[PDB]
């Protein structure tokens, strides 16, 4: 039951990291750079879902 708070909190931490790269890229005015950072954020968050689900399935399945 705590595994869910570990996963939920790690996800926000990862989100904050991804958000930082988007805003940093934004600060340049280079649209392509923000896109690059955003594509990385999206793939990373999808991968993160797999990791969290794997962890959850593995411990509670």
């Amino acid at each position: 039951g705590a595994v869910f708070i570990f996963v939920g909190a790690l996800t926000v931490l990862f989100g904050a990291i991804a958000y930082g790269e988007v805003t940093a890229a934004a600060a340049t005015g280079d649209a392509a750079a923000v896109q690059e950072a955003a594509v990385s954020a999206i793939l990373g968050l999808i991968i993160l879902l797999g990791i969290n689900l794997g962890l959850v399935a593995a411990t509670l399945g």
């Binding site: 790690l10 990862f14 990291i17 991804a18 930082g20 790269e21 690059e36 950072a37 594509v39 990385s40 954020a41 793939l43 990373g44 991968i47 993160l48 797999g50 990791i51 794997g54 962890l55 399935a57 593995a58 411990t59 399945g61």
Partner: protein, 220 residues
């Protein structure tokens, strides 16, 4: 966050595991000690590797990207310990253990060599790593699961749970290799590093905690 901040987080998480595993281990019997020692080596080695990267060492330039040698070197050293831990649970034979450690090592060596190759032929090396990994998964879910099924219910139950954690999460690493700096570089270096820190921590420290929690329930 920067790369070194993430490396420091990796190092600290691994240290926390190591400390927890060492201390949980003061309570163990002759046949139990090897499990705790194995967990200490796994997280202890990874802790040092993360310090090395955090200190800016082993950042190897490969074409226009950076591959972290200590990442792959510490996998090479620690993944065989994870397979060893699983094989002990399964009750594996001398010969079959040699087979899984070999397959494991082929995966890790191929991925390390591939990360180092600037040209497109790095994907052939990845491919060889991937085929070996499928062979590894087969042993884990086939023969090794068959062996484990012959042990006590508590042991069988821990094996299956650690097996599932291992099979699912280890399957994610090659996708990160392909999407990160070693492959098509769609993941930024930072995101690549964050995902691997998380994954390393779960497959070592999470794995260990799961084992600690079951071991306590069994003996007592």
């Amino acid at each position: 966050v920067g790369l070194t901040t993430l490396f420091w987080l990796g190092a600290i998480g691994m240290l926390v595991g190591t400390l927890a595993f060492a201390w949980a281990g003061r309570d163990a019997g002759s046949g139990e000690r090897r499990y705790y020692v194995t967990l200490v080596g796994i997280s202890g080695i990874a802790a040092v590797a993360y310090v090395v990267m955090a200190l800016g060492v082993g950042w190897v330039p490969v074409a226009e990207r950076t591959v972290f040698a200590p990442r792959y070197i510490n996998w090479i050293l620690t993944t065989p310990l994870i397979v060893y831990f699983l094989g002990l649970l399964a009750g594996l034979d001398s010969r079959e253990f040699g087979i899984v450690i070999t397959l494991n090592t082929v995966v890790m060596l191929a991925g390390f060599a591939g990360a180092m190759v600037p040209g497109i032929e790095r994907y052939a090396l990845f491919g060889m790593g991937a085929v070996a990994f499928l062979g590894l998964v087969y042993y884990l879910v086939g023969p090794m699961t068959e062996s484990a099924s012959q042990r006590s219910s508590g042991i069988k139950s821990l094996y299956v749970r650690l097996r599932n954690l291992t099979v699912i999460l280890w399957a994610i690493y090659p996708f990160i290799w392909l999407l990160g700096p070693p492959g098509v570089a769609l993941l930024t270096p930072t995101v690549d590093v964050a995902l691997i820190v998380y994954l390393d921590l779960v497959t070592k420290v999470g794995f260990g905690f799961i084992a600690l929690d079951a071991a306590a329930t069994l003996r007592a």
